[PDB]
Design a protein around this ligand. Sequence first.
Ligand code: SAM
Length: 212
Amino acid sequence: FVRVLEKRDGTVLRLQQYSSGGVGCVVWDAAIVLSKYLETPEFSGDGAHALSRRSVLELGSGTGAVGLMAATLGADVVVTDLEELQDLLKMNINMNKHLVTGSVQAKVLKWGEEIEGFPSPPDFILMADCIYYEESLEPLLKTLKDISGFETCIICCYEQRTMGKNPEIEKKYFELLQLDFDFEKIPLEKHDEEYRSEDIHIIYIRKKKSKF
Ligand SMILES: C[S@@+](CC[C@H](N)C(=O)[O-])C[C@H]1O[C@@H](n2cnc3c(N)ncnc32)[C@H](O)[C@@H]1O
């Protein structure tokens, strides 16, 4: 009942998906793509967004897969989700703390609700498959605006769902996003050569600050 995700160095993250009492969350494909993206040279010492010793907030962590990966890369990570997912997050911190080279802790952060502030804006905010929640889009973007500063690197990874109401929900997300943020799509050629998909996008989001 463990989902496994292997790092570039052969070490292996292990993620439980069921917490006792109905509460649970699976590891989503977008979390695998973003996690393995964090292991590309882009987030190494000689890279554009070195992760080691930097502050990282993850929203909608679920199992914690992405934030845990960042913690095995030297970041000081806070993984967050709803109250009911805190037990699962703590279990997965326990299963992977032997691989953590930075730090990792879990906190409740329900989108739209103000929580324990950072002393200064995080260096990164990470999100995997956080966007198809129509009812929580304005809350999510409020949290993002409240926490990020002009230097925060916001990385948003999501699997594009092409059927149903999802195309519509996706457009509402971007229309709300553009009021306060810029974005830029990371070309597929920069994802992990193995763990990528034309259906799974990575976008860098930045708090807008125009000179005009
Ligand atoms: C599709 S899952 C993705 C989980 C994980 N990031 C991954 O990719 O494997 C979305 C996550 O967002 C969380 N979430 C949904 N609405 C939320 C809200 N209003 N506030 C905080 N978290 C929320 C869910 O509990 C769930 O863990």
